[PDB]
């Protein structure tokens, strides 16, 4: 039944995104979209058909593109699954992604309990 | 008596797993282990005694846990059989599983032929 007010969603959810940004160095690969030309990885978009990154999620929060909090959680989880799929378990970026996922899991659980 | 090296298997088999990940929305329930507490299905682990999902399979490919290609195929097929067993034929999840199974059959057929 409930309609989420855009600023209510933004206020509840942005602290969880801000917690990811504070992770340095782990958030740095995730602060802007993956650029396969800069990185020299022409197969990236062969494998990742739905790219996502922190700046895109932040812009969707700013502009009211999320109707309900699970749409935001789905984008954060998509971001992580893209990096875990494309990069090997031993790689730096994969370990960075796991650290962000660890932080996100700790932040998001009490927030979603209070929203639903 | 051919020996299959970890990286050899990974290069051959990873594309077939990547093809499943590309299916959206159908791969989304399969990208992480089933969480019966999150989903509110407490009998899940009564029926599924050997859970399996894409992220676990990907990890086993990354870490060399498959000795031969059929061990990978067996895990993908276990994944599917778990979903078809637990969910009814008319359910969304079951239909999503069938879609992944159709993609997998098309992708694995030539790969297995080239490996043997
Ligand atoms: C995620 C992901 N998933 O797969 C992959 C693959 C990634 C991913 C993405 C970015 C990565 C990254 C891995 N490795 C690094 C760096 C550089 C190379 C290797 C290294 O060791 N450290 N970067 C940086 C690239 C550009 C930087 N900023 C940026 O573009 O500055 C402007 C001014 C706008 C030009 C910041 C981040
Ligand atoms: C397979 C299978 N076999 O039996 C069953 C049963 C499944 C199965 C499994 C997952 C399912 C699923 C069915 N239905 C959905 C969604 C939500 C439920 C209602 C719906 O209509 N669609 N999900 C999602 C659950 C959580 C999602 N992500 C996730 O955990 O995010 C973090 C951040 C880590 C918390 C991704 C997938
Ligand atoms: Mg953990």
Residue numbers in the entry:
A (entry chain B), B (entry chain A): 1082 to 1197
Task: Share the article's original sentences.
Many proteins, including the EP300/CBP histone acetyltransferases (HATs), contain several targetable domains. EP300 and CBP broadly regulate the activity of other proteins through their protein acetyltransferase catalytic activity. EP300/CBP are critical gene-regulatory targets in cancer, with existing high potency inhibitors of either the catalytic HAT domain or protein-binding bromodomain (BRD).
The resultant compounds displayed a >1000-fold loss of affinity for EP300 and CBP. A co-crystal structure of the CBP bromodomain with compound 1 demonstrated that the side chain R1173 is more flexible than in co-crystal structures with CCS1477 and assumes a conformation incompatible for hydrogen-bonding with the piperidinone oxygen, while weakly interacting with a nitrogen of the benzimidazole core. Notably, activity against BRD4 was reduced by ~10-fold, indicating that the hydrophobic van-der-Waals (VDW) interactions observed between the difluorophenyl moiety of CCS1477 and the WPF shelf of BRD4 contribute to binding affinity, but relatively less so in the EP300/CBP bromodomain. To further evaluate the specific effects of CCS1477-int(1) as a case example, we performed further CellTiter-Glo dose-response growth assays in HDMB03 and MB002 G3MB cells, demonstrating a blunting of anti-growth effect in cells treated with CCS1477-int(1), as compared with CCS1477. Thus, the difluorophenyl group is a critical moiety in the CCS1477 pharmacophore that facilitates potent interaction with the bromodomain of EP300/CBP and is required for efficacy in cell line models of G3MB.
